[PDB]
Design a protein around this ligand. Sequence first.
Ligand SMILES: CCCCCCCCCCCC(=O)O[C@@H](COC(=O)CCCCCCCCCC)COP(=O)(O)OC[C@H](O)CO[C@@]1(C(=O)O)C[C@H](O)[C@@H](O)[C@H]([C@@H](O)CO)O1
Lengths: 256, 224, 220, 196, 210
Amino acid sequence: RSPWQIQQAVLFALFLRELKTRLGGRWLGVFWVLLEPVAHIAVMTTLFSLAHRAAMPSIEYPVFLITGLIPFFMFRGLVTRLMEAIDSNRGLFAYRQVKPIDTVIARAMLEISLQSIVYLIALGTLGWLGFHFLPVRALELAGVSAVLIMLGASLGLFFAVVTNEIPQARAIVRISLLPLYFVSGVIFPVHTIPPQYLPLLQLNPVLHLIELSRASFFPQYRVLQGINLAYPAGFALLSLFLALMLYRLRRHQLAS
Amino acid sequence: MKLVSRLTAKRLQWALVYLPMLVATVYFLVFSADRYVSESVITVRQTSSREDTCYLQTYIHSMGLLQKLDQQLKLREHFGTPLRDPLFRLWGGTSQEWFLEYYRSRVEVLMDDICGLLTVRVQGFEPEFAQALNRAILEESERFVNELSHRMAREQGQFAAAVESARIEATRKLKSLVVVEPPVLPEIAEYPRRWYNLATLLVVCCLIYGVVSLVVATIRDHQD
Amino acid sequence: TAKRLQWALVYLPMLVATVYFLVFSADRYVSESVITVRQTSSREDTCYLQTYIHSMGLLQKLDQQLKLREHFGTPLRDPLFRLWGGTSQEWFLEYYRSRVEVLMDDICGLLTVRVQGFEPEFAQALNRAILEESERFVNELSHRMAREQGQFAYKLALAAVESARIEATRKLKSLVVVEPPVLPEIAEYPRRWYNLATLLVVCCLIYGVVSLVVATIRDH
Amino acid sequence: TAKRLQWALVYLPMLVATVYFLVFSADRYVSESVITVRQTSSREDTCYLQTYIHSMGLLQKLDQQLKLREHFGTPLRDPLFRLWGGTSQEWFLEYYRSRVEVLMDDICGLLTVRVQGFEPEFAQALNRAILEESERFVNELSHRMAREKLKSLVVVEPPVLPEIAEYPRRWYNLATLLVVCCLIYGVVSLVVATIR
Amino acid sequence: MKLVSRLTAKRLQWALVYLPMLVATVYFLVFSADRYVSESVITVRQTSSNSREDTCYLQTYIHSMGLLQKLDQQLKLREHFGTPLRDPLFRLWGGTSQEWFLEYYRSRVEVLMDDICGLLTVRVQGFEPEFAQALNRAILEESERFVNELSHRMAREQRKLKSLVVVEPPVLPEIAEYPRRWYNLATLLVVCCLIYGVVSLVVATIRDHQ
Ligand SMILES: CCCCCCCCCCCC(=O)O[C@@H](COC(=O)CCCCCCCCCC)COP(=O)(O)OC[C@H](O)CO[C@@]1(C(=O)O)C[C@H](O)[C@@H](O)[C@H]([C@@H](O)CO)O1
């Protein structure tokens, strides 16, 4: 048996286990992951519909919200769920074909599959309501989505490796995932904030990725200066390098 | 249950990956038709103000302009010439609403809020036809704005010394359209991008095949 | 291999940095001026000036007048802080842009210019040269603006032409100076200690990351 | 050991500050003035005054008028705050900027100038000379602009003769130094104990 | 560290629990001095057109020094504020510096600005009600004189230009607003208790630790 085949086997089994425990005993989690974008959209439109109409009179608010929200939901899930994978299977590390990175990859693939299903369903009901739901340049959208996915998975693995001890710090990162929602262009277009606050917001790679995904989605969408893809690409590459290094070095102490 | 197990990975791959490739490859490289585009940028201005730009943007996708253009250049018979492509062609005998939707899908108007310019891109199966359609749209546009101004001034004159001023206002083209870039003449087709469409299709079918394989495997495992 | 990396990674760059900074460096005196253009009879005019200081035609006029080429190559002690003989025009422009610093106070609406030079008198003379050239630049810009309508054009029309021909010679816009160029006597630059501390931070970062890389690759 | 950081860290700065502030310090009187420039027929002129007060040319005219270089060298007992003889021009500029504090209140456009000196009459004279020269520059700007009383200075609070030395606050400085020195001791002791 | 065990519960109480009310009761009842307050409300208008900034001009001018010199020459504040020998805390000691006199005057005269629509309210404290009213009236008249001279100067360098609106004239108080004796006693009780509880907890844990 090749190492690749046993890797597929262990990933399949771990995916089955983690999909069973991610949703409820009678699949109550699927309702929550379908309803959370709905509640977010309801609150956001009912709070800023006229303001966003005044912002630019060319893009409807719900499609803008979906395109900026579903990738952020996937990124937040990848960051916040990948790091609990170590403590969920402490007792499972006794069968000599199971490694922590297998749990990491299983959780990541599930997060990706679930959010992709949610994205497809959301685009379907958005087109069903008479909105705009076809990306003009879908290949660049796929590229930016892949960059965002790799950045999120790398950060999740990095936080899983570093915070194997001190679980209080785990909680902390979830708190820091709340302001990241309110800054990275998810709610309101970034053309309305006063310009001197701009570069302090431009070190956030998720802002750049959201802006480029929206630009590749809509026809004739305007981006600001310094919203290059090179900065998120380099951030993701460096984060993945450091995460893999730290997992390799601190490998043996992730035992039972 | 039993119907869930009545398949395999190769069967799913043939159902969701290579068959769309076959139909897309025999469409785009064989059955498709070229679509040249012609591009212009216009903006009105008071002689001797984004409102009249809105009037123009609504008027381009209007219905009366479509009737005038069909009377002038006979768009209905032109768009049915490419039988090769049964989809992007205009089937004869269709209703007026579908014709209006087809025309709205062909000519595309875009606005930029920072500068206020109105860009028009017109799709046609011939380059000279696309240029002629763009020029006809522009001249009917200018005629519409001038006719609106003349209608207001003619109503003012119809209310009624001031008669000469009303006649001058009726004759004077107060609002005029200035063309930043004249309607261009295309050389090759650019909109039916075959290879890019095939590539994004490849990404899409790979993704849905992976997702459906995972969910069918988990429902097979749960059903046992 | 646990001590040799520290030797050349930081110890030696630090040592060469200190011997260069304490011995090989040369003085750079800075002349400071504070200006704001005013209409005789506003942010756009000082914006034009701010673009014009870092321009190239002004640099060519200054090179013709004050001969900046030979002076910036005189301090032979510095190999990196002097202008190399027979360099490129683009490198010369970048050197001039780096040696002349222009800041804007938008709330106060004032333009401050700090010009560096290897002699105390040259910095003041160069700053006065930029002042005079900027004044004549805005003056000639207004004159060229009025020249088209002056050259474009019964008795009242000729009277209007006579009354408008003086627009090409009237001094409509004037450069008001708040702080004239100064004559320094102690060099402000280089700031050896802050650059040294920056080298401490950068060298520590590179040493840490390369130590992590080596410790990771060690058990492979 | 721990007594080395117990004594040499916190005590010696306290003896240094005690032997400086109690005997070696020099009293510094301060005068204050509150002004605003207004046209007789305006924040730009206020900003002009702000950048002109701390300038170079004004320092040269004031050194010609009142010779501050001689006045700031009188106290030999204070080695820090006195102006050392034969120093650089730039250090003289920083010394003048430290000795003349200007504050901007932009909710109504008010300039306030506090001038420190070792003599009270000298401080008042310096403040009055600064006010007069700033007014002269304010109208001279418009005179040079219109050459090829346009403006006036409104004096809310004229320069005031001080009677007692407001600066330096010896007890306040000693107390805040003591607090920081103890804090520093606390943090270094905690880390040096928790490293063990 | 040996003195930590000395601080028993009965001791720390007499320390900061009871002592403070002893000194507060023997000060606020038999040693303090009454301070009558006169309140006026003004605003300067735009009559010199042929305006919050002039109100802030006035706010800076009231707490100035030249006005204090004028008022000291006019009504002799320095000898008046040394009248109560009973209370030294609320009294102006003789022979003090000019800067301390300025700080005392700034403490006695309180100026606030209603900022929604700019109303200048002035409260003046004095040991006699008629003196407080007189000081308020003198402040208002010097205020009007300065705001008129504020323009008279540039008019002369280049008629009552500006004007002072008196919404609420300086009233004559009957009873003294300050000091609030029983109120200060109640807040003092609250604070002295809170700190006693906190320090009792900290002395208990430092006794248990060592
Ligand atoms: C001010 C910024 C915005 C306003 C937020 C206001 C905070 C809400 C109020 C507190 C909501 C709340 O629940 O508290 C939070 C505190 O907010 C944060 O996280 C700060 C987020 C910083 C990242 C922001 C990046 C932005 C992203 C841009 C790209 C967790 O902290 P906590 O005090 O509750 O933890 C105490 C635990 O009991 C024990 O943890 C320890 C401890 O004592 O052993 C251990 C460890 O040191 C650390 O976890 C902890 C401490 O020291 C480390 O700050 O203390």
